[PDB]
Design a protein around this nucleic acid. Structure first.
Ligand SMILES: [Mg+2]
Ligand SMILES: [Mg+2]
Lengths: 223, 218
DNA sequence: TATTATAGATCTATAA
DNA sequence: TATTATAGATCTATAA
């Protein structure tokens, strides 16, 4: 997929280039993953698939020596049980669940940084938060990149957090032939059990009009 | 219901006593609302009902001039569309959704404070966040008071936020008969349409010698 | 086995 | 009616 990046607290000057390269290469290689919605009135419509996307990233990063689901130390257990990935001094959270998780993940990362807890036998120095762009139709209230950008931009203006964060947004060109992974799961909601997965051709239709102030999400189609 | 309070950034001295009285008297007179779980291993077991609780609070506060769902001004629209209630300079969030909402609600309150946005014709000065105690069985990942206290306590230890916040936890004594409102909605999940509602007596059974209790009605 | 605590998925409710 | 937006509700997945 394509990516857009926004850096906070100089994450760009802090993030190890090799560690970033491993993350970047994985996200650039990755095709857009879609699945059928079960939302009323749009049953069967294609939406961004967070299950497939998360599994792809896990399958790519673990072999690159990023540890998955690193436990959070008992002294911070009220902040959670684990972090998605980590390698050396870098933590990564892939966040496609509902929007408040952006601030939950941001604030807990701040506290981890303030106390310098270890990520991978090294104190934490920077966090990467992966999100999907607004352009893709998706479950209601799932976090999207522009939303995260706007919120973190405001927190930065007001000096709310000092931890370096590289915010990544997964995007694609509109109205362009691209390869898409389309997955069918064993149940219409929540299942992570694959029934069928195929790589197909598709594109993202731009449904904006001169009056929609670019808020319309695209329509995904596959052939 | 009974209540427990934890204050941050001196909300105890900053919060207007009269405004607090209006919120407190509502929470104190309110019966515990419960409904059936639709979770796979426990279909039918009684759990805290956020729908009934939220509606009860709205029905009490709106007549007392607390505006509901006040729109958030366009300049802060990336923080959301509305706030649950506000009166004068005080914002109230009733939060029974999933736990990350606690930090989302806290951070946006901090920004509303830093930027002085108007709540009800006055700039925001204090937030009240209402939550339910861990003691009640409830949907998975729904926020509970002790978790909120632990997180805000840690943020306060590290001097992360400055906005005054009064955190309220709704609780009951265990093993004591109390008033309960038990409701059946039109659909087993999400519905806010009441099909049947009964006011009954019941209690929260404790198996502790911290585990959650079991709610029963009579 | 059976229960929890997240974490993640993803729905409906509601207004603009 | 169709879409946007959260906000709220509340499920399953997974491991401890
Ligand atoms: Mg994640
Ligand atoms: Mg609320």
């Amino acid at each position: 997929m394509k990516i857009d990046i926004t850096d906070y607290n100089h994450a760009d000057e802090i993030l190890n280039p090799q560690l970033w390269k491993e993350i970047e290469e994985t996200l650039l290689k990755m095709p857009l993953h879609v699945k059928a919605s079960d939302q009323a009135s749009k049953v069967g419509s294609l939406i961004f698939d967070p299950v497939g996307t998360n599994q792809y990233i896990k399958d790519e990063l673990v072999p690159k020596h990023w540890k998955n689901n690193i436990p959070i130390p008992k002294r911070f257990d009220f902040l959670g049980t684990d972090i998605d990935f980590g390698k050396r001094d870098t933590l990564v959270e892939v966040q496609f669940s509902n929007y408040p998780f952006l601030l939950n993940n941001t604030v807990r990362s701040e506290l981890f940084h303030k106390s310098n807890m270890d990520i991978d036998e090294e104190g934490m120095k920077v966090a990467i938060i992966i999100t999907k762009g607004h352009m893709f139709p998706a479950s209601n209230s799932s976090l999207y990149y522009e939303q995260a950008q706007n919120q973190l931009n405001s927190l930065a203006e007001y000096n709310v957090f000092d931890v370096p964060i590289r915010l990544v947004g997964l995007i694609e060109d509109f109205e362009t032939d691209i390869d898409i992974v389309s997955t069918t799961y064993a149940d219409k909601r929540y299942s992570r059990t694959i029934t069928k997965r195929d790589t197909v051709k598709g594109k993202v239709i731009d449904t904006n009009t001169p009056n929609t102030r670019r808020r319309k999400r695209g329509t995904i189609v596959t052939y």
